């Protein structure tokens, strides 16, 4: 089980017994199965799924042709779901939030917010140097290694662009599902900025 | 730190490969037909979007 949605934002909900829990609101307009991949034609089993209807002027003839099989409007996001039952899916079939029931344990994948160029202290959580006692070493990435190699070993972590990485959070919980609004409330927080793509799947660990 | 070895002509030219200028956004002006930068007032006729300014 899986679906693609948009990270609407964060709020909180009162459950039964009055406990207050933080939830992420993810909207998922019914996704459309655009293609079914098999061992014969592609060498593996998976279903391609499209989401977020796109204005025609923003699409290409190749993109319009590709979705013509599913007989729907152009989709902004397209992703393949594996480890599913191909028998239950076919081109043109729709997937709605009601695939998940409240209390389901899921894995949520997103693209982390971009922090741009960042120093080692923030990027890798390294330690600062002393800020006084004559210290002239505050936010630098530490030594680069021993003398003997006459080089720097790989993975010597330094400053650079931060964020914007594919991150999965495992074993989140589906607090609620609102089919009319095409909304899923997931306990906790998930990677990515608001309006970014989100991928909900049934937790692999379970 | 100082250059341990002088930079040869070949290596120097390789580095300057990308050190070049570019000219973009030039196209004919509607009013007078002379070349102008797109989204800018045609400096010759002072016209933009078919009107003098």
């Amino acid at each position: 089980k899986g679906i693609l949605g948009k990270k609407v934002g964060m709020t909180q909900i009162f459950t039964e017994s009055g406990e207050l829990i933080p939830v992420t609101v993810v909207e998922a307009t019914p996704n459309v199965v655009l293609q079914v991949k098999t061992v014969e034609t592609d060498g593996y089993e998976a279903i391609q799924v499209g989401y977020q209807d796109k204005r025609e002027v923003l699409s290409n003839k190749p993109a319009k042709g590709h979705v013509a099989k599913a007989n729907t409007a152009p989709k902004r996001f397209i992703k393949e779901f594996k480890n599913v039952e191909l028998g239950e899916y076919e081109v043109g079939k729709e997937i709605k939030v009601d695939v998940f029931q409240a209390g389901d344990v899921v894995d949520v994948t997103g693209t982390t917010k971009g922090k741009g160029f960042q120093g080692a202290i923030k990027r890798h959580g390294q330690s600062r140097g002393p800020m006084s006692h004559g210290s002239r070493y505050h936010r630098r990435p530490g030594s680069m290694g021993p003398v003997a190699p006459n080089r720097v070993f790989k993975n010597k972590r330094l400053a650079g662009r931060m964020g914007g990485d594919r991150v999965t959070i495992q074993n989140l919980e589906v607090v609620k599902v609102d089919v009319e609004r095409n909304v899923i409330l997931i306990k906790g927080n998930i990677p990515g900025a608001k309006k970014s793509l989100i991928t909900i799947k049934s937790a692999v660990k379970a | 730190a100082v250059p341990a070895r002088r930079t040869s002509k070949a290596k120097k030219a390789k580095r300057r490969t990308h050190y070049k200028l570019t000219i973009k956004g030039l196209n004919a002006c509607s009013n007078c037909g002379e070349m102008k930068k797109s989204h800018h007032v045609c400096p010759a006729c002072g016209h933009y979007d078919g009107k003098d300014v």
Binding site: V8, T11, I13, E27 | -
Partner: protein
């Protein structure tokens, strides 16, 4: 944001009285020492109101046994049976953080009887 408002509109409570920071309120807070449920009355001046919608919260301060205590409650928590406005005080600001340093007479608030 409108979508979030719609989702949380259901759980928004309605019997919330009209109170602002500086007013004395009595909160009938539900507690559970196990299966048995009980109501504890926390009475004190409202020191702070912040947030919006379902996320709104408020803080109540009382000096008990010579030690100041502050309880922060979600404004729409079902665990609070009732909020009761004992008095309306006169204050000139939204946050009464200065009250933390004050003791006794210095921390008194003039009533207005809205």
């Amino acid at each position: 944001n409108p979508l979030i408002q719609e989702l949380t509109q259901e759980q928004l409570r309605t019997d919330i009285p009209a109170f602002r920071p500086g007013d004395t309120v009595r909160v009938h807070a539900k507690v559970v020492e196990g299966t048995r449920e009980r109501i504890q009355l926390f009475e004190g001046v409202v020191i702070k109101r912040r947030g919006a919608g379902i996320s709104e919260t408020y803080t109540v301060r009382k000096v008990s046994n010579g030690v100041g205590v502050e309880r922060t409650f979600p404004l729409h928590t079902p665990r609070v049976a009732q909020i009761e406005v004992v008095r309306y005080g006169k204050v000139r600001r939204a946050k009464l953080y200065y009250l933390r340093a004050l003791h006794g007479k210095a921390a008194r608030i003039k009533e207005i009887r809205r």
